[PDB]
Amino acid sequence: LAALNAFVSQVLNKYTEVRGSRRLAQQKINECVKSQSNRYGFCGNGTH
Amino acid sequence: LAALNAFVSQVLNKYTEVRGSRRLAQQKINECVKSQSNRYGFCGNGTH
């Protein structure tokens, strides 16, 4: 039972990073695929 | 052995925060050091 608990407590921590990674994916889709953003150092190091 | 496992599981979680902290540093270097960004509330509370 203690072995199962430590695994659950790790899977729950693992799910948290993915939702933080999805915000960046949505932001890039919104800014570089539909709008041609002009912020330096953002998609591509040159002129998008 | 169980004492070592809990320490490894903590060091691995610790390394994950630094990767999220480095993106902000790279963004600030790319935006305020080379481009003079104009977003309010970003580097400095006034006019950069």
Swiss-Prot record, chains A, B:
It is found in: Virion membrane; Host endoplasmic reticulum-Golgi intermediate compartment membrane. The lineage of its organism: Viruses, Riboviria, Orthornavirae, Pisuviricota, Pisoniviricetes. Glycosylated by host with heterogeneous N-linked glycans protruding from the trimer surface. Highly glycosylated by host, occluding many regions across the surface of the protein. Homotrimer. During virus morphogenesis, found in a complex with M proteins. Interacts with host ACE2. This is Spike glycoprotein. Glycans are attached at N45. It comes from the Viruses. S1 region attaches the virion to the cell membrane by interacting with host ACE2, initiating the infection. Binding to the receptor probably induces conformational changes in the S glycoprotein unmasking the fusion peptide and activating membranes fusion. S2 region belongs to the class I viral fusion protein. Under the current model, the protein has at least 3 conformational states: pre-fusion native state, pre-hairpin intermediate state, and post-fusion hairpin state. It comes from Human coronavirus NL63 (HCoV-NL63). Belongs to the alphacoronaviruses spike protein family. Disulfide bonds join C32-C43. The KxHxx motif seems to function as an ER retrieval signal.
